Design a protein around this ligand. Structure first.
Ligand SMILES: Cc1cc2c(cc1C)N(C[C@H](O)[C@H](O)[C@H](O)COP(=O)(O)OP(=O)(O)OC[C@H]1O[C@@H](n3cnc4c(N)ncnc43)[C@H](O)[C@@H]1O)c1[nH]c(=O)[nH]c(=O)c1N2
Ligand SMILES: *[C@@H]1O[C@H](CO)[C@@H](O[C@@H]2O[C@H](CO)[C@@H](O)[C@H](O)[C@H]2NC(C)=O)[C@H](O)[C@H]1NC(C)=O
Ligand SMILES: *[C@@H]1O[C@H](CO)[C@@H](O)[C@H](O)[C@H]1NC(C)=O
Ligand SMILES: *[C@@H]1O[C@H](CO)[C@@H](O)[C@H](O)[C@H]1NC(C)=O
Ligand SMILES: *[C@@H]1O[C@H](CO)[C@@H](O)[C@H](O)[C@H]1NC(C)=O
Ligand SMILES: *[C@@H]1O[C@H](CO)[C@@H](O)[C@H](O)[C@H]1NC(C)=O
Ligand SMILES: *[C@@H]1O[C@H](CO)[C@@H](O)[C@H](O)[C@H]1NC(C)=O
Ligand SMILES: O=[N+]([O-])c1ccc(O)c(O)c1
Ligand SMILES: O=[N+]([O-])c1ccc(O)c(O)c1
Ligand SMILES: [Cl-]
Ligand SMILES: [Mg+2]
Ligand SMILES: [Mg+2]
Ligand code: NA
Length: 585
């Protein structure tokens, strides 16, 4: 046996396994669906970024009712290190009220104040060079960035010149410099912190910082290329798991834990292990003939992501060099790669197609003249309208509680709802951080090799389009500001300056929005059971003992931010919670 078995070796699972194995008396087995990465340049080198190397195969959405019935490929990691291995390295905390809100949903011990020590513990920030900080407008608050923890983060050591035009344009249209977007607010523009190790200018993924770093430990066991197919019980006690080869061989093996089973299989993997195990909605489990261990209608409910929109541009006078120079100028690409290979300088320190700065805005900052109208529409509409009729009443109550917290965020000048970015080339990116829409992920069968049904339900809540349209218009203000007009931008078809009404704009958005930035969360939510929750404030699955959810399945709702930094910090916090209960070193 092992002391603990962890299902999924992604950000959350490896962070937890690392910390638990600090006690030599504690053995851990991490069972991970994907292989070890091979240190490929497409993983390690930012400018070579190749995320597709380790996408989970064979996942497709249902037709998306809110997006013209489009079906999309579903993107999530299948590799040791999980999303950290293949993500764009964007390393950002949420805003204070995100965590305060999770606490106010009925989770004692959850707040910005309680998370801050764990954000700090998680990481080591390496400052940029002083000349780059001065030239680039890179600022930070050293008091609230970690100095000693395992996740390395820093910045690229270069910026494209057009990033300057964009920064000044953003400032011209009400997005001011942010001193530190890690300080619990991020209203305006700032350099993107990147999960890079500055001594080599390579990715600091969880494979490295929470496994390789500590892989001399004989008590830290890993089994790549295997799937946890079921949790095993003695009565209501979780005692073990079954696992199978990911490649589908007709072999099944049982392994047992003396203390706990931890699920860390991600937003799209954790609910499937629970449902196959008899933990889930009795309607679904009864339909499939799965005996019910714990009737929890929230399992697989409440799916969220953070939609994206790519806006195409042409320019009469774009500045050289820019991100597209890497793809259209072989000489420039070769010279920048040679530069990186020699002295680790230049464009290859930036994740491919990204720039170095970004903007985040509250609803009132996006829509100063109309945000009250959006809030009124959202306040007027019954929460139940966002979910199908016959949704479990506990799931509706939890959704209503989330919705009320998000409407307070809409009123808050210090909580973000959307992002604007320009890579310096042919497209801009606009992200919707705070959707009110909610989706599902449900097993289709008892076959552990079968993909679940994944329905994002993007744009089913009509408030989302109102918010997203406002974010689009703010992006258009940046491109129209004096500092950007000198580059001669114009929106390209199917967008265009000739689309002036909300209806004209959103009709194109409905055809182009991607439901996902691979930020899937919230499908095993941490809320009271009578609110459709799956886990307690201690991340224990209701109705069974010895079973927790560590991955971002547990989140109630999305952050003003991207998930990675909080995925690390939340697993740092859970490690301490488990150590305290079991009196570990
Ligand atoms: C391409 C891409 C791009 C981005 C991002 C993701 C991806 C895929 N993200 C999102 C972020 O990386 C993600 O939200 C976190 O990795 C989630 O961490 P978890 O621990 O919840 O799951 P994570 O996905 O890290 O790990 C879950 C693991 O479980 C495994 N698994 C699933 N089912 C299993 C089973 N039954 N048995 C065994 N193993 C199983 C999977 O193979 C996977 O490795 C991101 N975030 C951000 O902040 N900045 C960014 O730049 C980006 N960009
Ligand atoms: C990545 O973070 C780690 C953790 O803070 C840094 O590791 C320290 O590195 C210094 C110098 O090599 C050592 O003196 C310390 O003993 C290390 N501390 C730990 C606890 O490992 C590492 O330096 C970081 N990377 C960069 C670029 O700073
Ligand atoms: C999507 O499909 C449904 C039937 O499943 C249909 O009623 C609806 O009109 C379609 N939506 C669009 C935008 O075509
Ligand atoms: C930095 O900010 C200053 C002051 O607004 C501005 O003049 C300058 O162009 C900015 N540079 C970059 C690279 O953002
Ligand atoms: C797997 O092996 C068992 C035991 O031999 C057998 O009964 C079953 O048919 C096999 N299943 C498949 C999918 O081949
Ligand atoms: C291509 O890049 C090189 C190397 O930086 C530069 O000298 C040249 O002018 C570029 N060519 C074009 C057409 O931009
Ligand atoms: C509107 O502009 C778009 C984008 O350039 C172009 O496709 C289209 O021809 C324009 N529409 C009309 C009516 O000219
Ligand atoms: O969710 N998606 O659709 C994504 C997210 C990130 C990616 O790099 C990608 O190629 C697709
Ligand atoms: O700046 N932010 O807050 C961001 C940046 C990137 C993201 O993908 C995100 O979801 C939020
Ligand atoms: Cl491997
Ligand atoms: Mg220095
Ligand atoms: Mg300055
Ligand atoms: Na430098």
């Amino acid at each position: 046996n092992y002391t603990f078995i962890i299902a999924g070796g992604g950000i959350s699972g490896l962070t937890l396994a690392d910390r638990l194995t600090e006690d030599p008396r504690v053995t851990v087995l991490v069972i991970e669906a994907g292989p070890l990465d091979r240190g490929e340049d497409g993983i390690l080198v930012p400018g070579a970024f190749s995320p597709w190397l380790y996408f989970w195969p064979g996942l497709v959405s249902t037709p998306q009712a809110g997006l013209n019935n489009r079906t999309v490929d579903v993107i999530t990691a299948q590799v040791v290190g999980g999303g950290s291995t293949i993500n764009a390295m964007v390393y950002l905390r949420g805003d204070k009220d995100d965590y305060d809100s999770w606490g106010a949903l009925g989770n004692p011990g959850w707040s910005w104040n309680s998370m801050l020590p764990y954000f700090i513990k998680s990481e080591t920030f390496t400052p940029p060079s002083p000349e780059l900080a001065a030239a680039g407008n890179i600022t930070w608050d050293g008091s609230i960035r970690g100095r000693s923890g395992p996740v390395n983060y820093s910045y690229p050591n270069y910026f494209f010149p057009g990033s300057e035009n964009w920064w000044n344009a953003a400032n011209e249209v009400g997005l001011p410099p942010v001193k530190d977007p890690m300080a619990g607010s991020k209203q305006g523009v700032f350099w993107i912190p990147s999960a890079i190790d500055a001594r080599t200018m390579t990715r600091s993924h969880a494979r490295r910082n929470h496994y390789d770093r500590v892989s001399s430990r004989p008590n830290y066991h890993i089994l790549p290329s295997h799937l946890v197919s079921k949790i095993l019980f003695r009565g209501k006690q979780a005692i073990g798991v079954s696992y199978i080869p990911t490649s589908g061989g007709n072999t099944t093996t049982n392994v047992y834990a003396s203390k706990e089973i931890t699920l860390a299989a991600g937003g799209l993997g954790t609910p499937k292990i629970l449902q196959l195990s008899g933990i889930g909605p009795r309607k679904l489990l009864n339909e499939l003939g799965i005996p019910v261990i714990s009737d929890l209608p929230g399992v697989g409910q409440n799916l969220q992501d953070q939609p994206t929109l790519t806006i195409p541009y042409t320019f009469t006078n774009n500045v050289f060099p820019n991100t597209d120079s890497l793809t259209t100028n072989a000489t420039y690409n070769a010279e920048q790669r040679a530069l990186y290979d020699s002295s680790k300088q230049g464009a290859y320190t930036i994740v491919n197609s990204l720039s170095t700065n970004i903007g985040v805005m509250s609803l009132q900052r996006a829509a100063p003249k109309s945000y009250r109208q959006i809030i009124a529409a959202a306040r007027a509409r019954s929460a139940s309208l966002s979910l199908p009729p016959g949704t479990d009443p506990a799931v509706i109550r939890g959704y209503q509680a989330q919705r009320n917290a998000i409407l307070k965020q809409f009123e808050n000048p210090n909580v973000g709802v959307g992002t604007v970015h320009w890579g310096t080339g042919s497209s801009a990116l606009v992200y919707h951080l705070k959707p009110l829409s909610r989706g599902t992920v449900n097993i289709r069968s008892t076959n552990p090799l079968d993909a679940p049904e994944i329905d994002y339900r993007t744009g089913t809540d009509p408030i989302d389009a109102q918010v997203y349209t406002s974010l689009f218009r703010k992006n258009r203000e940046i491109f129209n500001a004096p500092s950007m007009r000198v580059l001669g931008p114009s929106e390209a078809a199917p967008f265009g300056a000739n689309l002036t009404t909300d209806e004209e704009i959103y009709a194109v958005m409905r055809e182009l929005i991607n439901p996902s930035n691979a930020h899937q969360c919230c499908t095993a939510a941490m809320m009271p059971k009578d609110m459709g929750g799956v886990v307690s404030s201690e991340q224990k699955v209701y109705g069974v003992q010895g079973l927790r959810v560590a991955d971002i399945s547990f989140w109630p709702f999305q952050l003003s931010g991207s998930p990675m930094a909080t995925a690390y910090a939340g697993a740092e916090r859970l490690a301490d919670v488990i150590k305290k209960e079991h009196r570990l070193a």
